[PDB]
Scaffold this motif. Structure first.
Motif, PDB file in Angstrom:
ATOM      1  N   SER A 209       0.823  -1.202   0.000  1.00  0.00           N
ATOM      2  CA  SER A 209       0.000   0.000   0.000  1.00  0.00           C
ATOM      3  C   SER A 209       0.860   1.257   0.000  1.00  0.00           C
ATOM      4  CB  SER A 209      -0.940   0.008   1.208  1.00  0.00           C
ATOM      5  OG  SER A 209      -0.213   0.067   2.421  1.00  0.00           O
ATOM      6  N   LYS A 867      -9.226  -3.292   7.000  1.00  0.00           N
ATOM      7  CA  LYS A 867      -8.109  -3.856   6.254  1.00  0.00           C
ATOM      8  C   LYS A 867      -8.502  -5.201   5.664  1.00  0.00           C
ATOM      9  CE  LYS A 867      -4.382  -1.569   8.805  1.00  0.00           C
ATOM     10  NZ  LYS A 867      -3.031  -1.732   9.410  1.00  0.00           N
ATOM     11  N   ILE A 868      -8.278  -5.355   4.360  1.00  0.00           N
ATOM     12  CA  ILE A 868      -8.462  -6.618   3.655  1.00  0.00           C
ATOM     13  C   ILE A 868      -7.130  -6.998   3.026  1.00  0.00           C
ATOM     14  CG2 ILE A 868      -9.958  -7.914   2.100  1.00  0.00           C
ATOM     15  CD1 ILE A 868     -11.521  -6.519   4.203  1.00  0.00           C
ATOM     16  N   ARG A 872      -5.120  -1.415   3.773  1.00  0.00           N
ATOM     17  CA  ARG A 872      -6.119  -0.457   4.227  1.00  0.00           C
ATOM     18  C   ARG A 872      -7.125  -0.151   3.123  1.00  0.00           C
ATOM     19  NH1 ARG A 872      -6.934   4.784   3.477  1.00  0.00           N
ATOM     20  NH2 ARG A 872      -8.093   5.972   5.062  1.00  0.00           N
ATOM     21  N   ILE A 873      -8.397  -0.068   3.502  1.00  0.00           N
ATOM     22  CA  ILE A 873      -9.495   0.160   2.570  1.00  0.00           C
ATOM     23  C   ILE A 873     -10.176   1.473   2.933  1.00  0.00           C
ATOM     24  CG2 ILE A 873     -11.682  -0.702   1.671  1.00  0.00           C
ATOM     25  CD1 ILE A 873      -9.229  -2.290   0.811  1.00  0.00           C
ATOM     26  N   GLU A 874     -10.334   2.348   1.943  1.00  0.00           N
ATOM     27  CA  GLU A 874     -11.101   3.578   2.102  1.00  0.00           C
ATOM     28  C   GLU A 874     -12.551   3.282   1.734  1.00  0.00           C
ATOM     29  OE1 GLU A 874     -10.115   6.674   3.230  1.00  0.00           O
ATOM     30  OE2 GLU A 874     -12.232   7.242   3.104  1.00  0.00           O
ATOM     31  N   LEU A 875     -13.414   3.186   2.748  1.00  0.00           N
ATOM     32  CA  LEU A 875     -14.816   2.860   2.508  1.00  0.00           C
ATOM     33  C   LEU A 875     -15.543   3.948   1.729  1.00  0.00           C
ATOM     34  CD1 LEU A 875     -15.780   1.293   5.962  1.00  0.00           C
ATOM     35  CD2 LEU A 875     -15.284   0.108   3.814  1.00  0.00           C
ATOM     36  N   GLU A 877     -14.536   5.390  -0.963  1.00  0.00           N
ATOM     37  CA  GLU A 877     -14.413   5.115  -2.390  1.00  0.00           C
ATOM     38  C   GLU A 877     -15.436   4.086  -2.851  1.00  0.00           C
ATOM     39  OE1 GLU A 877     -10.384   3.953  -3.024  1.00  0.00           O
ATOM     40  OE2 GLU A 877      -9.560   5.946  -2.613  1.00  0.00           O
ATOM     41  N   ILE A 878     -15.904   3.229  -1.943  1.00  0.00           N
ATOM     42  CA  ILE A 878     -16.940   2.265  -2.296  1.00  0.00           C
ATOM     43  C   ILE A 878     -18.314   2.918  -2.257  1.00  0.00           C
ATOM     44  CG2 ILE A 878     -17.710  -0.097  -1.916  1.00  0.00           C
ATOM     45  CD1 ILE A 878     -15.250  -0.564  -0.225  1.00  0.00           C
ATOM     46  N   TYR A 933     -12.056  -7.424  -3.784  1.00  0.00           N
ATOM     47  CA  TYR A 933     -12.096  -7.332  -2.330  1.00  0.00           C
ATOM     48  C   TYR A 933     -12.752  -6.051  -1.830  1.00  0.00           C
ATOM     49  CZ  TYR A 933      -7.878  -4.542  -3.203  1.00  0.00           C
ATOM     50  OH  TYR A 933      -6.981  -3.606  -3.663  1.00  0.00           O
ATOM     51  N   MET A 934     -13.194  -5.171  -2.728  1.00  0.00           N
ATOM     52  CA  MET A 934     -13.880  -3.946  -2.347  1.00  0.00           C
ATOM     53  C   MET A 934     -15.347  -3.951  -2.758  1.00  0.00           C
ATOM     54  SD  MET A 934     -10.995  -1.003  -3.029  1.00  0.00           S
ATOM     55  CE  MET A 934     -11.945   0.214  -2.125  1.00  0.00           C
TER      56      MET A 934
END
Ligand SMILES: [Cl-]
Ligand SMILES: [Cl-]
Ligand SMILES: [Cl-]
Ligand SMILES: [Cl-]
Ligand SMILES: [Cl-]
Ligand SMILES: [Cl-]
Length: 958
Positions: A209, A867-868, A872-875, A877-878, A933-934
């Motif tokens: 990342s 985290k997946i 780190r995942i920015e929710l 953006e989903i 994964y998102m």
């Protein structure tokens, strides 16, 4: 007719060639040599003829047999050396070596090795040599050049007959190595190494990342550019001495350096760095020309915050353990591991480090030739270093152009060079405490972007800002509550009358006064009177349960409780209750309206102005003690940046338990504008807000983002043409909501503000003035006399674009938490960047990062991180991609942590009146825009969002 089998690496290239995918330049091993001096062209031909005579790999063809490919070997034959001319020029030479790397080979007929003797002068030639990768590798070019230089020096200078071979015979050939490998891949030794790599790479982060200048595309862009990198003599000698003392090689030391740096930049504890390895463990194989090289994935861990000596000891064992299992092909490793191969990046690792020996230490000067300018970025970053004989270490850092800018990679090498210097200097310190920022970037992050000093009056309180305004504008309207009005003079008289009854009681400096009332004229009278009396006001919103009010009342331990008429709240013994309105309020309404003298109150800017409690999300509510001087600076900045006019109006619509109401109260009262007290919350019509804006001509408004959405979607929002400003605080503001306010009300100026209750009210601001708005609205630049810092685990500033904990410093930091000193000492730490006596710094617990334009970006809390795959995942953006889908109006995505250690993504939707959305339509259309994964697992529709008392989105109610 001898037919030998192919090695595993050769069968993969053959399988790729039949599909038409081995056409890249990366499958050709190209080299070159500059020949300064007279050239014995007959001896050079005898040397090239002897090399193909010795190595039967250079006489190898490839064909089918019973379906499967076989390795055919021909008889020796003269070398295919093409002679031609060459004009002097850097571009003329770079063309022919580009042709050598581009031109494909014929695997069916051959030959798989070729060359070009470019003649420049009568005593200067350029010999290019290129062979297919199914027959050679990087080590083979070193064997080719070393074996060619000794054969020429023997045929030309020693006058040895070309009939005989002057070099030692090869102990075996590449066909022997392939027969051994085919038998090895079916045995137990292949099962052992496959079992090791599964265990070693189990749970490793699949994708790095690293912060990039641009997001990575769905299909990987293999185009890349290069940044040179060189370590001076002092650093190279220090790294060689550090490596000798810890039993590591220069490769291991640089590997520990890069893995430690990437861990800091990417916000990940483990880093996986790939590396090529020469699969030539048997000493007999070191002199062959064949496809031997293999790839090794090295998993470095920095979760223990190790020292320099402890990180080197780790990398030492993990490299030696990886090198003791290098026989297993890397393609079987990626097949035996869990992570799925993606088209966006490479498997297992995205960063590669490679090392190689220096140049070879006569009559003809066989000097080597450097590689070409173009480089195929097979990975995100590729570090390729070598030990030069002059005493320095130099190489090239190849970066994928689609991800990074040239300036960003130049900073990356600067971090690595500074980090390596710290490791060589002191091997006892923790490796993540070593300084990496350059003097320019450190001064830009700490000083330039904190240049917010202003010479505001520091000997004035908030109530004096109002007392100074009533003398400039006494006859102007100040308060408006349901038709009734109060001038600045009448409001000052009512506040002075109540301040005397408070001062008659035990109210003084730092004493608390509880104010329990709904919105009315007496609410502002109570607040100003408490400040005039010298104390701090504690708002008790009657909308909360009596259990909460009785706790905040007992924890604050006030001297007086200012209570409205129809309020059943009762305090404990010792404190005196005092009516705010009604017949029971005639004791204080009969006081003289003359102002209290400044020396009678004894109040100072360093005394408390208010004590507002927290919501109590992670424990019981805490009383945030805020001083006078902090609120004054917050109010004076808002007028300096926005300029409220005396004729404008501001709507008090935020609950006064929310510290946003602080500037809703005192900003217009300190400038000359009128404050319209809105109707209490429980008595409002859905169309009350729209008609109150146009009815009272409200100029400045505040919304939390979830409340601004309901205002945009309300009936008749376009009627609010008289609004000048809209301020957003609390939640994060989506860009789609800001762009919709841009269309509905084009004349309003939207501003985004950020700040916790412990930093007075707000500390950063960003104007939504850009023609192009991003999906992630920045929180902006700091306000007057307040500094902002993004620190790591060691409290040190992180580089630009790197995520860290947001720290607030300046005059707006609160005194602490009331009655809880240990929690204050933990989150109100000393400020080392101020250079002041006892300046403090507030730990927000919010994740953020500096943007290149000098602005801050909100990244959420530390405890709310998703985290997946260890990434780190920015929710947001989903959620933003769901709102673009047709049939969807709004969206919220949460991470429901079930029993597995991999949270389930659940999406929550607000549907458009047209129809309800379908799950398969959202699943397939989003599967193409976002990675696998998102994409949420389930989608549920709701009529409206549940809200908190302050109007924010209640994610816990979902
Ligand atoms: Cl393990
Ligand atoms: Cl491997
Ligand atoms: Cl810089
Ligand atoms: Cl807040
Ligand atoms: Cl939302
Ligand atoms: Cl669930």
């Amino acid at each position: 007719a001898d037919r030998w089998p192919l090695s595993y690496a050769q069968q993969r290239l053959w399988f790729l060639a039949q599909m038409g995918q081995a056409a890249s330049s990366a499958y050709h091993i190209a080299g070159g040599l500059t020949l300064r001096g007279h050239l014995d062209e007959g001896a050079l031909q005898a040397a090239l003829d002897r090399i193909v005579q010795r190595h039967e790999a250079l006489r190898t063809r490839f064909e089918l047999q019973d379906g499967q490919p076989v390795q055919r070997i021909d008889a020796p034959r003269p070398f295919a050396l093409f002679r031609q001319a060459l004009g002097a020029g850097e571009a003329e030479l770079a063309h022919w070596q580009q042709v050598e790397a581009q031109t494909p080979f014929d695997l069916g007929t051959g030959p798989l090795i070729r060359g070009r003797l470019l003649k420049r002068n009568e005593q200067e030639h350029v010999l290019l040599l290129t062979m297919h990768h199914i027959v050679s590798d990087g080590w083979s070019m070193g064997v080719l050049a070393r074996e060619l230089g000794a054969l020429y020096r023997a045929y030309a200078e020693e006058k040895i007959g070309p009939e005989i071979d002057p070099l030692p015979a090869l102990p075996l050939q590449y066909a022997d190595y392939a027969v051994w490998q085919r038998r090895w891949l079916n045995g137990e030794l292949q099962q052992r190494q496959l079992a090791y790599w599964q265990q070693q790479m189990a749970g490793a982060p699949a994708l790095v990342s690293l912060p990039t200048d641009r997001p990575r595309p769905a299909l990987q862009d293999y185009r890349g550019e290069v940044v040179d990198i060189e370590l001076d003599a002092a650093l190279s000698a220090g790294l060689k001495r550090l490596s000798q003392r810890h039993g590591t090689t220069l490769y291991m030391t640089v590997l520990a350096a890069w893995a430690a740096l990437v861990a800091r930049l990417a916000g990940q504890s483990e880093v996986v760095i790939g590396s090529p390895v020469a699969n030539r463990q048997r000493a007999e194989l070191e002199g062959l020309i064949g496809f031997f090289v293999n790839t090794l994935a090295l998993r470095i861990d920095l979760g223990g915050d190790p020292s320099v000596a402890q990180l080197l000891a780790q990398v030492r064992e993990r490299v030696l353990a990886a090198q003791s299992h290098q026989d297993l092909p890397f393609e079987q490793v990626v097949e035996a591991l869990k992570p799925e191969r993606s088209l966006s990046h490479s498997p297992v690792f995205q960063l590669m480090l490679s090392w190689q020996s220096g140049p070879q230490p006569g009559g003809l000067g066989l000097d080597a030739l450097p590689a070409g300018s173009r480089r195929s970025a097979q990975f995100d970053l590729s570090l390729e270093l070598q030990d030069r004989g002059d005493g320095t270490i130099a190489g090239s850092l190849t970066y994928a152009s689609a991800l990074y800018e040239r300036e960003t990679v130049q900073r990356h090498a600067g971090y690595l060079k500074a980090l390596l210097a710290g490791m060589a200097a002191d091997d006892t310190q923790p490796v993540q405490r070593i300084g990496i920022l350059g003097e320019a970037e450190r001064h830009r992050l700490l000083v330039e972007w904190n240049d917010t000093a202003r010479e505001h009056p520091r000997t004035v309180c908030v109530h004096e800002l109002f007392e100074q305004q009533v003398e400039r504008s006494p006859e102007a309207v100040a308060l408006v509550y349901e038709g009734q009005q109060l001038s600045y003079r009448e409001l000052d008289r009512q506040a002075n009358r109540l301040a005397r009854q408070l001062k008659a009681l035990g109210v003084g400096p730092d004493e608390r006064v509880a104010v329990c009332t709904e919105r009315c004229l007496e609410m502002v009278v109570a607040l100003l009177a408490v400040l005039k009396a010298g104390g701090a006001y504690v708002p008790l919103d009657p909308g909360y349960p009596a259990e909460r009010l009785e706790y905040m009342l007992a924890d604050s331990a006030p001297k007086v409780l200012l209570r409205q008429s129809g309020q059943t709240l009762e305090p404990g013994a010792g404190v005196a209750v005092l009516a705010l309105d009604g017949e029971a309020s005639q004791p204080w309404q009969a006081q003289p309206a003359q102002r209290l003298s400044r020396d009678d109150s004894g109040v100072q800017p360093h005394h408390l102005a208010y004590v507002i409690y927290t919501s109590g999300s992670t424990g019981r509510p805490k009383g945030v003690m805020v001083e006078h001087a902090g609120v004054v600076n917050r109010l004076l900045w808002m007028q300096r940046a926005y300029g409220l006019q005396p004729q404008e109006a501001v709507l008090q619509k935020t609950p006064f338990g929310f510290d946003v109401s602080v500037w809703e109260f005192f900003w217009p009262l300190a400038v000359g504008a009128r404050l319209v007290m809105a109707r209490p919350q429980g008595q409002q019509d859905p169309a009350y807000l729209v008609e109150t804006i146009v009815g009272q001509d409200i100029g400045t408004l505040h919304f939390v983002p979830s409340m601004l959405q309901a205002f945009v979607d309300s009936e008749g929002v376009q009627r609010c043409r008289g609004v000048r400003r809209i301020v957003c605080s609390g939640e994060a503001l989506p860009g789609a909501l800001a762009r919709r306010l841009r269309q509905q009300l084009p004349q309003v100026e939207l501003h985004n503000l950020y700040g916790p209750t412990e930093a007075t009210v707000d500390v950063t601001a960003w104007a939504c003035d850009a023609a192009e708005l991003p999906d992630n609205i920045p929180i902006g630049r700091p306000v007057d006399n307040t500094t902002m810092y993004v620190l790591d685990a060691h409290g040190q500033p992180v580089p630009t674009g790197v995520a860290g904990e947001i720290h607030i410093g300046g005059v707006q930091v609160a005194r602490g938490y009331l009655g809880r000193p240990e929690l204050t000492r933990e989150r109100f730490v000393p400020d080392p960047y101020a250079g002041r006596p006892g300046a403090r710094l507030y730990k927000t617990g919010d994740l953020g990062r500096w943007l290149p334009d000098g602005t801050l970006e909100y990244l959420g809390r530390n405890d709310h991180q998703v985290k997946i795959r260890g990434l780190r995942i920015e929710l947001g953006e989903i959620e933003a991609q769901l709102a673009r889908q047709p049939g969807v109006r709004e969206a919220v995505v949460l991470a429901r942590q079930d029993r597995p250690g991999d949270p389930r993504l659940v999406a929550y939707l607000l549907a458009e009146p047209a129809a309800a959305p379908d799950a398969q339509v959202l699943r397939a259309a989003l599967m193409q825009v976002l990675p696998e994964y998102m994409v949420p697992a389930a989608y549920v529709a709701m009529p409206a969002w549940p809200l908190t008392p302050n109007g924010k989105l209640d994610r816990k109610a979902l």
